[PDB]
Amino acid sequence: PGGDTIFGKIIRKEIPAKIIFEDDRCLAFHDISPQAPTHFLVIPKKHISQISVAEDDDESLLGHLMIVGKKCAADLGLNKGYRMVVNEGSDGGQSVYHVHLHVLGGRQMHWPPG
Amino acid sequence: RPGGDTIFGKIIRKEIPAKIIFEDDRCLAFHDISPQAPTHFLVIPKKHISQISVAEDDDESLLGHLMIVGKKCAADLGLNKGYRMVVNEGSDGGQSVYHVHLHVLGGRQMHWPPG
Numbered sequence: 001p002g003g004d005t006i007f008g009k010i011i012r013k014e015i016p017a018k019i020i021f022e023d024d025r026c027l028a029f030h031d032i033s034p035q036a037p038t039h040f041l042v043i044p045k046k047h048i049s050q051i052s053v054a055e056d057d058d059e060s061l062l063g064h065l066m067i068v069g070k071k072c073a074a075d076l077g078l079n080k081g082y083r084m085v086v087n088e089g090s091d092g093g094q095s096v097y098h099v100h101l102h103v104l105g106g107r108q109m110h111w112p113p114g
Numbered sequence: 115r116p117g118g119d120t121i122f123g124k125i126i127r128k129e130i131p132a133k134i135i136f137e138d139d140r141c142l143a144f145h146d147i148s149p150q151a152p153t154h155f156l157v158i159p160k161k162h163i164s165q166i167s168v169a170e171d172d173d174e175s176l177l178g179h180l181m182i183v184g185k186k187c188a189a190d191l192g193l194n195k196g197y198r199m200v201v202n203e204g205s206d207g208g209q210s211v212y213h214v215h216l217h218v219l220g221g222r223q224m225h226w227p228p229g
Protein backbone atom coordinates (compact mmCIF):
# COMPACT_ATOMS: atom_id res chain seq x y z
CA PRO A 1 0.00 0.00 0.00
CA GLY A 2 2.67 2.51 -1.03
CA GLY A 3 5.38 0.55 0.74
CA ASP A 4 7.23 0.36 4.04
CA THR A 5 9.42 3.45 3.73
CA ILE A 6 9.07 7.04 4.85
CA PHE A 7 7.88 7.86 1.31
CA GLY A 8 5.04 5.34 1.80
CA LYS A 9 4.05 7.25 4.94
CA ILE A 10 4.05 10.49 2.96
CA ILE A 11 1.85 8.95 0.24
CA ARG A 12 -0.61 7.68 2.87
CA LYS A 13 -0.64 11.17 4.48
CA GLU A 14 0.56 9.71 7.78
CA ILE A 15 3.33 12.26 8.07
CA PRO A 16 3.44 15.75 6.62
CA ALA A 17 5.23 16.99 3.53
CA LYS A 18 4.88 20.16 1.48
CA ILE A 19 2.92 18.77 -1.46
CA ILE A 20 3.27 20.48 -4.83
CA PHE A 21 1.12 18.19 -6.97
CA GLU A 22 -0.79 14.93 -6.76
CA ASP A 23 -2.70 12.68 -9.12
CA ASP A 24 -3.90 9.08 -9.06
CA ARG A 25 -0.45 7.61 -9.65
CA CYS A 26 2.20 10.01 -8.30
CA LEU A 27 3.02 12.69 -5.76
CA ALA A 28 5.38 15.67 -5.91
CA PHE A 29 6.66 17.32 -2.75
CA HIS A 30 9.52 19.46 -1.51
CA ASP A 31 12.57 17.60 -0.23
CA ILE A 32 13.13 17.85 3.52
CA SER A 33 16.89 18.32 2.99
CA PRO A 34 17.01 20.70 0.02
CA GLN A 35 20.27 20.93 -1.94
CA ALA A 36 19.19 23.92 -4.04
CA PRO A 37 16.81 26.87 -3.60
CA THR A 38 14.18 24.66 -5.23
CA HIS A 39 14.48 20.93 -4.61
CA PHE A 40 11.53 18.59 -4.87
CA LEU A 41 10.77 14.93 -5.50
CA VAL A 42 8.30 13.20 -7.79
CA ILE A 43 7.47 9.65 -6.69
CA PRO A 44 5.13 6.93 -7.98
CA LYS A 45 2.38 5.75 -5.65
CA LYS A 46 3.24 2.20 -6.76
CA HIS A 47 6.05 0.87 -4.58
CA ILE A 48 8.93 0.31 -6.94
CA SER A 49 11.93 -0.04 -4.62
CA GLN A 50 14.57 1.11 -7.09
CA ILE A 51 14.88 1.85 -10.78
CA SER A 52 16.93 -1.34 -11.33
CA VAL A 53 13.82 -3.44 -10.64
CA ALA A 54 11.39 -1.37 -12.71
CA GLU A 55 9.40 -3.51 -15.15
CA ASP A 56 8.81 -2.85 -18.84
CA ASP A 57 5.13 -2.22 -18.03
CA ASP A 58 6.27 0.71 -15.85
CA GLU A 59 7.63 2.68 -18.80
CA SER A 60 4.81 5.19 -19.11
CA LEU A 61 4.61 5.65 -15.32
CA LEU A 62 8.33 6.51 -15.20
CA GLY A 63 7.90 8.96 -18.05
CA HIS A 64 4.92 10.40 -16.20
CA LEU A 65 7.21 11.24 -13.27
CA MET A 66 9.42 13.25 -15.64
CA ILE A 67 6.49 15.08 -17.27
CA VAL A 68 5.03 15.93 -13.85
CA GLY A 69 8.53 17.00 -12.78
CA LYS A 70 8.98 19.37 -15.69
CA LYS A 71 5.46 20.83 -15.23
CA CYS A 72 6.08 21.41 -11.53
CA ALA A 73 9.45 23.00 -12.32
CA ALA A 74 7.71 25.47 -14.64
CA ASP A 75 5.04 26.17 -12.01
CA LEU A 76 7.77 26.85 -9.44
CA GLY A 77 9.36 29.40 -11.76
CA LEU A 78 12.50 27.50 -12.78
CA ASN A 79 12.85 29.35 -16.08
CA LYS A 80 16.67 29.26 -16.13
CA GLY A 81 16.76 25.46 -16.00
CA TYR A 82 17.16 22.61 -13.56
CA ARG A 83 18.52 19.12 -13.05
CA MET A 84 16.64 15.83 -12.70
CA VAL A 85 18.25 12.95 -10.83
CA VAL A 86 17.44 9.32 -10.07
CA ASN A 87 19.77 7.54 -7.65
CA GLU A 88 20.24 3.77 -7.69
CA GLY A 89 21.86 1.75 -4.93
CA SER A 90 24.87 2.48 -2.76
CA ASP A 91 27.12 3.97 -5.46
CA GLY A 92 24.19 6.09 -6.66
CA GLY A 93 23.63 7.39 -3.13
CA GLN A 94 20.01 6.25 -3.07
CA SER A 95 18.65 7.34 0.31
CA VAL A 96 15.17 5.71 0.36
CA TYR A 97 14.24 2.45 -1.34
CA HIS A 98 11.22 3.86 -3.13
CA VAL A 99 11.90 5.20 -6.64
CA HIS A 100 12.13 9.00 -6.63
CA LEU A 101 12.96 11.66 -9.19
CA HIS A 102 14.82 14.69 -7.76
CA VAL A 103 14.31 18.05 -9.41
CA LEU A 104 16.79 20.78 -8.41
CA GLY A 105 17.07 24.38 -9.54
CA GLY A 106 17.30 28.01 -8.53
CA ARG A 107 21.09 27.97 -8.68
CA GLN A 108 23.76 26.92 -11.13
CA MET A 109 24.12 23.13 -11.00
CA HIS A 110 27.70 21.98 -11.48
CA TRP A 111 29.60 19.24 -13.30
CA PRO A 112 30.27 16.46 -12.44
CA PRO A 113 26.82 15.77 -10.90
CA GLY A 114 28.35 14.38 -7.73
CA ARG B 115 16.00 15.14 -40.63
CA PRO B 116 15.43 11.99 -38.60
CA GLY B 117 17.34 12.58 -35.39
CA GLY B 118 17.60 16.37 -35.63
CA ASP B 119 20.46 18.80 -36.27
CA THR B 120 22.59 18.38 -33.15
CA ILE B 121 25.67 16.23 -32.90
CA PHE B 122 23.37 13.56 -31.42
CA GLY B 123 21.42 13.49 -34.70
CA LYS B 124 24.72 12.94 -36.51
CA ILE B 125 25.38 10.02 -34.14
CA ILE B 126 21.88 8.60 -34.73
CA ARG B 127 22.41 8.65 -38.52
CA LYS B 128 25.92 7.11 -38.20
CA GLU B 129 27.50 10.26 -39.69
CA ILE B 130 29.91 10.62 -36.79
CA PRO B 131 31.25 7.71 -34.72
CA ALA B 132 30.09 6.62 -31.31
CA LYS B 133 30.64 3.67 -29.00
CA ILE B 134 27.16 2.23 -29.04
CA ILE B 135 25.83 0.05 -26.23
CA PHE B 136 22.23 -0.46 -27.35
CA GLU B 137 19.97 0.59 -30.20
CA ASP B 138 16.30 0.16 -30.96
CA ASP B 139 13.63 1.97 -32.99
CA ARG B 140 13.08 4.54 -30.24
CA CYS B 141 16.49 5.21 -28.74
CA LEU B 142 20.23 4.84 -28.69
CA ALA B 143 22.68 4.36 -25.80
CA PHE B 144 26.35 5.25 -26.24
CA HIS B 145 29.39 6.13 -24.13
CA ASP B 146 30.10 9.75 -23.22
CA ILE B 147 33.30 11.19 -24.76
CA SER B 148 34.02 13.09 -21.54
CA PRO B 149 33.22 10.57 -18.81
CA GLN B 150 32.66 11.89 -15.29
CA ALA B 151 32.70 8.42 -13.74
CA PRO B 152 34.44 5.15 -14.64
CA THR B 153 31.28 4.26 -16.58
CA HIS B 154 29.35 7.16 -18.10
CA PHE B 155 26.91 6.73 -20.98
CA LEU B 156 23.93 8.54 -22.52
CA VAL B 157 20.51 7.31 -23.56
CA ILE B 158 18.84 9.46 -26.18
CA PRO B 159 15.58 9.32 -28.13
CA LYS B 160 15.81 8.96 -31.90
CA LYS B 161 12.97 11.52 -32.09
CA HIS B 162 14.44 14.99 -31.61
CA ILE B 163 13.13 16.72 -28.49
CA SER B 164 15.28 19.72 -27.63
CA GLN B 165 15.03 19.56 -23.83
CA ILE B 166 12.81 18.08 -21.15
CA SER B 167 11.03 21.40 -20.55
CA VAL B 168 9.38 21.15 -23.99
CA ALA B 169 8.50 17.44 -23.95
CA GLU B 170 4.85 16.75 -24.76
CA ASP B 171 2.42 14.69 -22.68
CA ASP B 172 2.48 12.03 -25.41
CA ASP B 173 6.25 11.67 -24.95
CA GLU B 174 5.73 9.87 -21.62
CA SER B 175 6.30 6.32 -22.85
CA LEU B 176 9.40 7.39 -24.76
CA LEU B 177 10.90 9.18 -21.77
CA GLY B 178 10.20 6.18 -19.55
CA HIS B 179 11.77 3.96 -22.20
CA LEU B 180 15.00 5.96 -21.89
CA MET B 181 15.08 5.09 -18.18
CA ILE B 182 14.27 1.41 -18.70
CA VAL B 183 16.98 1.17 -21.37
CA GLY B 184 19.34 3.06 -19.04
CA LYS B 185 18.83 0.62 -16.21
CA LYS B 186 19.12 -2.41 -18.52
CA CYS B 187 22.38 -1.14 -20.02
CA ALA B 188 23.72 -0.41 -16.54
CA ALA B 189 23.05 -4.02 -15.55
CA ASP B 190 24.62 -5.31 -18.76
CA LEU B 191 27.69 -3.16 -18.04
CA GLY B 192 28.00 -4.69 -14.58
CA LEU B 193 27.07 -1.62 -12.51
CA ASN B 194 25.90 -3.88 -9.70
CA LYS B 195 26.77 -1.42 -6.91
CA GLY B 196 24.52 1.27 -8.36
CA TYR B 197 24.54 4.37 -10.52
CA ARG B 198 23.08 7.83 -10.99
CA MET B 199 20.77 8.96 -13.79
CA VAL B 200 20.74 12.66 -14.70
CA VAL B 201 18.80 14.92 -17.05
CA ASN B 202 20.15 18.45 -17.48
CA GLU B 203 17.80 21.25 -18.52
CA GLY B 204 18.91 24.66 -19.76
CA SER B 205 21.56 27.00 -18.41
CA ASP B 206 21.21 26.24 -14.70
CA GLY B 207 21.15 22.52 -15.51
CA GLY B 208 24.38 22.80 -17.47
CA GLN B 209 22.83 21.49 -20.69
CA SER B 210 25.27 21.83 -23.62
CA VAL B 211 23.50 19.72 -26.26
CA TYR B 212 19.86 20.56 -26.95
CA HIS B 213 18.64 17.06 -27.68
CA VAL B 214 17.04 15.40 -24.64
CA HIS B 215 19.33 12.81 -23.05
CA LEU B 216 19.69 10.72 -19.93
CA HIS B 217 23.17 10.44 -18.38
CA VAL B 218 23.96 7.21 -16.53
CA LEU B 219 27.07 7.34 -14.30
CA GLY B 220 28.58 4.58 -12.18
CA GLY B 221 31.64 2.62 -11.16
CA ARG B 222 32.47 4.91 -8.25
CA GLN B 223 30.73 6.39 -5.24
CA MET B 224 28.58 9.33 -6.36
CA HIS B 225 28.42 12.26 -3.93
CA TRP B 226 25.69 14.58 -2.68
CA PRO B 227 24.62 17.14 -3.76
CA PRO B 228 24.52 16.02 -7.40
CA GLY B 229 26.34 19.15 -8.56
Ligand SMILES: C[C@H](N)C(=O)NS(=O)(=O)OC[C@H]1O[C@@H](n2cnc3c(N)ncnc32)[C@H](O)[C@@H]1O
Pocket residue numbers: 111121132145146147148149156202208209210211212
Ligand atom coordinates in the same frame (compact mmCIF):
# COMPACT_ATOMS: atom_id res chain seq x y z
C1 LIG C 1 29.07 19.40 -20.31
C2 LIG C 1 27.75 19.83 -19.67
N1 LIG C 1 27.88 19.99 -18.23
C3 LIG C 1 26.70 18.80 -19.92
O1 LIG C 1 26.52 17.88 -19.13
N2 LIG C 1 25.99 18.96 -21.04
S1 LIG C 1 24.81 17.96 -21.41
O2 LIG C 1 23.90 17.72 -20.34
O3 LIG C 1 24.12 18.43 -22.60
O4 LIG C 1 25.49 16.62 -21.74
C4 LIG C 1 25.92 16.36 -23.07
C5 LIG C 1 26.93 15.23 -22.98
O5 LIG C 1 27.22 14.83 -24.31
C6 LIG C 1 28.60 14.48 -24.34
N3 LIG C 1 29.06 14.53 -25.74
C7 LIG C 1 29.24 15.62 -26.50
N4 LIG C 1 29.67 15.27 -27.73
C8 LIG C 1 29.76 13.92 -27.75
C9 LIG C 1 30.14 12.90 -28.74
N5 LIG C 1 30.53 13.29 -29.99
N6 LIG C 1 30.09 11.61 -28.35
C10 LIG C 1 29.70 11.24 -27.11
N7 LIG C 1 29.34 12.12 -26.15
C11 LIG C 1 29.35 13.44 -26.43
C12 LIG C 1 29.28 15.49 -23.43
O6 LIG C 1 30.55 14.99 -23.01
C13 LIG C 1 28.24 15.65 -22.32
O7 LIG C 1 28.49 14.83 -21.16
